[PDB]
Amino acid sequence: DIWWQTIGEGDCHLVLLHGWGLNAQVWDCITPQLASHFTLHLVDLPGYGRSGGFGAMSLEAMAQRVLEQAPPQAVWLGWSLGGLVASQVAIMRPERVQALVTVASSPCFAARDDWPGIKPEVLAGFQQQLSDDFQRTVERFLALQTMGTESARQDARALKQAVLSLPMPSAEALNGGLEILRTVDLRQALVRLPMPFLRLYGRLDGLVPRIVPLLDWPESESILFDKAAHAPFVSHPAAFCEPLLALKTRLG
Amino acid sequence: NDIWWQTIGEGDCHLVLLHGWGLNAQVWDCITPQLASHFTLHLVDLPGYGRSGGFGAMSLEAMAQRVLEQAPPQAVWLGWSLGGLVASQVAIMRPERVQALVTVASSPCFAARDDWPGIKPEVLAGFQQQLSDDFQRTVERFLALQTMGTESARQDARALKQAVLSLPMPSAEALNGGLEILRTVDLRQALVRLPMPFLRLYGRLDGLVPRIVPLLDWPESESILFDKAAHAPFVSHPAAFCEPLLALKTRLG
Amino acid sequence: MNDIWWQTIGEGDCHLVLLHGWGLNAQVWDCITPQLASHFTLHLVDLPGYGRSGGFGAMSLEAMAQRVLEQAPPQAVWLGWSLGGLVASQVAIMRPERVQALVTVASSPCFAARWPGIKPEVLAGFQQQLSDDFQRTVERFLALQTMGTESARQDARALKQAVLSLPMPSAEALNGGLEILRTVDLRQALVLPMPFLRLYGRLDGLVPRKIVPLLDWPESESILFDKAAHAPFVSHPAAFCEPLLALKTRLG
């Protein structure tokens, strides 16, 4: 069904959800640093990577399918689009999420009134370009996520390699992904999450504008990566892991 | 177990200030009015020092944990000398609490090690024994050691001495433990992977923390050397000390 | 492809040449170059015969080091993995003014036993077996360089990925490299006027624990990783970058 790979054997399970257009291979470089401290669940989201053969679906539905293969309890970490999925799971079944971690994610990707974000028509235009130029629209959207850093070239290639080492996902899965980002808004639903909530950001993130407002989710904690863009775990793997190890400990 | 903690100022951003070994939060008396309009200022007496009486010797880890417990959710943390190791330890342990790390006249590894400049262990050991057998003479030796070499040296040591004479000194055990922290702690590798901004202020003439280019090659941190300051550049050169703090607030937004 | 492929990454103004091992290419450094590009100008090399430098054949260890030198910077730290640790070492014998420091990782001066090590006739086996079953001989030799760790099957498929995404090295060059391992002893020519850092995996099958005799090289330093086998920068990235960053502090 859903490509799912389990690695390591700590008593704390960690579910890692990638972002739009990509797959679990994005975690290749931090899985070695984590697998001795967690049982790690590498997931290709439904419609993505080796989980082809799903079309579009609602965020809720994406979260129900990943939930249906998850361990009983686990820390849930979502990167970007994956951050919304991991968020939806915490909303739907809080007893399953010992703690929620989002990486370079926004509860509401599209700019709303007095809420920073992407212009709803920038993203709408990205769905049109996908019709006209499929292959190069995915590559251009991923090129956006490593821009701005003193590492952009090797980081853009890490992402680009990870989409090109597998057959492209369906164009309907991806367009649906873009729609989720365009229309989803979880700011309120997370106001009262009952479990530990850790939000990680990159300062130079061109998609998720740098946090102070979500800080004012008073129970959640946030870390801003000062020299990272939209993929802090690629450009800053060692700073990325350490708050996760600290988080396993705090749970205890 | 509660720590002396005074919040002053009416400023946008939070700034925790941590004094060095043997002193107390009064060392900041004469820069707080220039910072008061830009930061909410958190003036702390480290566990076992000054007004947070009744603590003995502890590890840097326990020390940083006790301070962090009365800390605001998110602040900029500025450490002077040993306070710099405390603030650094906080950065490492609890990055979500630390908007930015600043150290003044402070070293990640105070004692000289191989290929690493610092206080020679035997010189530190001599200071300890001197402190044990000849307390008040060694306090004066210490106060001179922080101000020596600058245009302003006597006036500055007098200012530091005022902060010493007017509060309870730390217990014999707290004193010895803190020297043992400086003797043993090495945070060099630990601070490579810090996620937040890291600003390091130094005095060119500082005789306790030698003149910086090894640490710059922490490539994501920044460093500033005041040509004319020694170990207390916020005493000797208040105006230049605050400027990079305003620049930091600009960077954080 | 009669050119040595050579890529430069970073702005750390200390230079660091990275030399891969038998069969592999610079892609094996994919997960550590982020950790190190902030601290070094990195030169990723594909040894001649391998990776993107495929249009070469068999050649002596000194021919290899000479070809690799021609495109190397004026001065640099030279770090070699496995077979690459013999190219590095050779370079710090032919032209030591070019080499600010020599680092070897899970490598030995004389790979074949005499002196603990690998039996010579079982490196004859791989050479012969390489003609009777090309693919599985390569796979089985590569498998030796990761097995022995808790992460053996992740680390193994990291190496296979790096091999499969580029042209398979020539049987000639692959045979040539096995020849270097089998024949060469550099134990005597390394008794050497630069700092000499030596990195080992306790669980390394191909490289035993000849460390304690090579500690006697009285001015060579050695570090053993207690849970690494032949590929410790893959199995343990963090513990691998730390000694490199402290070596850079010990210069300058």
From TrEMBL, chain B:
Q: Which GO terms describe its molecular function?
A: pimelyl-[acyl-carrier protein] methyl ester esterase activity; transferase activity
Superkingdom assignment: Bacteria
Gene3D superfamilies recorded: alpha/beta hydrolase (3.40.50.1820)
Catalytic-site annotation from UniProt:
S81 (nucleophile), D206, H231
**A GO CC term assigned to this protein in UniProt:** cytoplasm
Chief site of localization: cytoplasm
The listed locations are: Cytoplasm
Per the record, what are the reactions this protein catalyses?
Answer: 6-carboxyhexanoyl-[ACP] methyl ester + H2O = 6-carboxyhexanoyl-[ACP] + methanol + H(+)
E.C. code: 3.1.1.85
What's any GO biological process attached to this entry? biotin biosynthetic process
Give the residues the record marks as binding substrate.
Answer: W21, S81, L82, F142, L143, A144, L145, Q146, H231
| Keyword vocabulary terms for this entry | Biotin biosynthesis, Cytoplasm, Hydrolase, Serine esterase, Transferase
Q: Where is the AB hydrolase-1 domain?
A: 14-238
Q: Looking at the Swiss-Prot or TrEMBL record, what is one Pfam family this protein matches?
A: Abhydrolase_1
Q: What class of enzyme is it?
A: hydrolase
Pathway the protein contributes to: Cofactor biosynthesis; biotin biosynthesis
Q: Could you describe the subunit structure of this protein? A: Monomer.
Free-text function comment from the UniProt entry: The physiological role of BioH is to remove the methyl group introduced by BioC when the pimeloyl moiety is complete. It allows to synthesize pimeloyl-ACP via the fatty acid synthetic pathway through the hydrolysis of the ester bonds of pimeloyl-ACP esters.
- HAMAP family, per database record: Carboxylester
Q: Which family does it belong to?
A: Belongs to the AB hydrolase superfamily. Carboxylesterase BioH family.
Protein name per its UniProtKB record: Pimeloyl-[acyl-carrier protein] methyl ester esterase
**What organism is this sequence from?**
Klebsiella pneumoniae
From TrEMBL, chain C:
Q: Which domain of life is it from?
A: Bacteria
Query: Which parts of the sequence bind substrate?
Result: W22, S82, L83, F141, L142, A143, L144, Q145, H230
Pathway, per Swiss-Prot/TrEMBL? Cofactor biosynthesis; biotin biosynthesis
Q: Which GO terms describe its biological process?
A: biotin biosynthetic process
The free-text function statement in the UniProt record for this protein reads:
The physiological role of BioH is to remove the methyl group introduced by BioC when the pimeloyl moiety is complete. It allows to synthesize pimeloyl-ACP via the fatty acid synthetic pathway through the hydrolysis of the ester bonds of pimeloyl-ACP esters.
What InterPro entries does the entry give? Answer: AB_hydrolase_1, AB_hydrolase_fold, BioH, Carboxylesterase_BioH
Q: What is its EC number?
A: 3.1.1.85
Taking the first listed entry, what is the main subcellular location of this protein, grouped into a coarse class? cytoplasm
> What sort of enzyme, by top EC class, is this?
hydrolase
Q: Which GO terms describe its molecular function?
A: pimelyl-[acyl-carrier protein] methyl ester esterase activity; transferase activity
Q: Does the keyword Cytoplasm apply?
A: yes
What protein family does this chain belong to? Belongs to the AB hydrolase superfamily. Carboxylesterase BioH family.
**The reaction(s) this protein catalyses:** 6-carboxyhexanoyl-[ACP] methyl ester + H2O = 6-carboxyhexanoyl-[ACP] + methanol + H(+)
**How is this protein named in the record?**
Pimeloyl-[acyl-carrier protein] methyl ester esterase
Domain AB hydrolase-1 spans what residues?
Answer: 15-237
Report the PANTHER family cross-referenced here. Answer: HYDROLASE ALPHA/BETA FOLD FAMILY, PIMELOYL-[ACYL-CARRIER PROTEIN] METHYL ESTER ESTERASE
Q: Which HAMAP family does this one have?
A: Carboxylester
Q: Which SUPFAM superfamilies is this protein grouped with? A: alpha/beta-Hydrolases
One cellular-component annotation, GO: cytoplasm
Tell me the subunit arrangement: Monomer.
| Keyword Hydrolase assigned | yes
Name where it's found. Cytoplasm
Species, as recorded: Klebsiella pneumoniae
For this UniProt record, give its keywords in alphabetical order, as a comma-separated list.
Answer: Biotin biosynthesis, Cytoplasm, Hydrolase, Serine esterase, Transferase
Active site per database record = S82 (nucleophile), D204, H230
